[PDB]
Design brief:
Chain lengths: 46, 46, 44, 46, 46, 44, 46, 46, 44, 46, 46, 44, 46, 44, 46
């Protein structure tokens, strides 16, 4: 079944890409939450 | 009937391919709706 | 049903995330109420 | 009428999917409203 | 006229199919505009 | 008219939802006005 | 002119649909403005 | 020239159709930009 | 120009709507200024 | 060059449309800024 | 070579057309990014 | 470069608009600071 | 390899366009940040 | 992996930008806290 | 086998082209996600 092998390869590659993607989100989401909290607390203090 | 035999083989093959395709959809849609929900909830709870 | 299986997975995942969120909100709301008390005690 | 049976099957499947979908919305909308009210009341109190 | 007969049959068949198609549209559009209105009103009243 | 039937259904559904909403807003506005009174009575 | 009659029919149908649509907007826009004003006045009062 | 005659007829027919099409555009675009402006101004004045 | 005719219609319609809006804003702004005065007269 | 004349005509028409469009923007943008300033000043006064 | 001659003519013609097309792009893109910037800055300065 | 010419035009246009905007903001900020002073002088 | 030269040309052109684009962003982003800070400080002062 | 190389470049770039941002926020927050102190010292 | 030889050449050529194409993607996607992140972070830190 030429098809089975090919479909299998594509799924493998896709899984790898999702891995790299999860990494990037954490870096950006981290930064954004960081900046927000600093600004919020500072304003409440004075 | 040389045609019955042929038509049956092609349907069998098609069914196999739809199986492989459903698998790939659940990997990709999973990822997409996992990045979306992360981005939403983090912001709403911070 | 190849769809039932998928829909069930995504609900499971969602439930897990709401749990982590209910945690984060209690840490941040704590802080905010704590800045607001101390400032009050200090300024008439 | 080959067509009638086929159209009927597709509608059946569609109805089922809408069912699964309504379930998911309730879980997410519940959470979102919950977090909002907590934050609102807390701020008004002090 | 062997052609009149044929053209009439194909129009009849077409009319039947548009009936089945209108049905499916009202099920799907219903669902979509029911999820949208839920999401809007809940947020505006909370 | 296969469209008239459909448009009528969606209006009916909308009317039902606005009813449920007018309920929820009176429960929440009640709470908010009740926190604001008690805090006032307490702090000059 | 087969075309003229057909173009005429399509415009007629379109006009009818716009009518049904204007009705729906009024019901939703009414509700939204209603909820907004109630919330605004209540907050200003106390 | 049997061709001049033919080409002239087809251009005449085309011109007629563009007339009917311009009419339909002004009915539909009208409606769309009437629902948009209603939704905008009502919200901005309330 | 089948476009000039159309563009003119849409401007006419827009002008009408701005008129209705300038009305609604004076009714709502009135109310808001009226709640703010009465509350003041009542609380130091 | 049949093409040159045709390209020229299309540009001419396009320029005219941009003219009509600039007019409409001024009417709408005027209104929006107007309503905003009235609301802002009123709130600051009392 | 009767073919060299022909291929050369068609390239010449193509070059002419890309000139007319670049012109049209600068008129339309100009307008679009002029309406966008107007709408942005006016709102941010009012 | 048929693109260089175009990009240059759009930057020129943008610069002109920022100029008109820096004007409008000084007229509006003036007004806002002027309402806030007068109200203060009037109410303890 | 006719292809290699062609792919190379396209990349060269693309790089140039990105250059022109970075310039425009700086002019607009500069302005926007400027207007924001002025408004913010003024409000905090009085 | 022609994708690994690309994903790595974009993360590197992102890290650089977050650095520049943490700078800008400390300059602006400084200013805001400095306007709020001086105004207070001046008005009861 | 005169066909083996031919099929092998065409695969070789294809592989070369996918190399050139991957290169172009990393230049363009780079630029796009560099303009986006600039616009986001500047606004959130000002």
């Amino acid at each position: 079944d030429p098809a089975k092998a090919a479909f299998d390869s594509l799924q493998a590659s896709a899984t790898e890409m999702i891995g790299y993607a999860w990494a990037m989100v954490v870096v950006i989401v981290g930064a954004t939450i960081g900046i927000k909290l600093f600004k919020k607390f500072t304003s409440k203090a004075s």
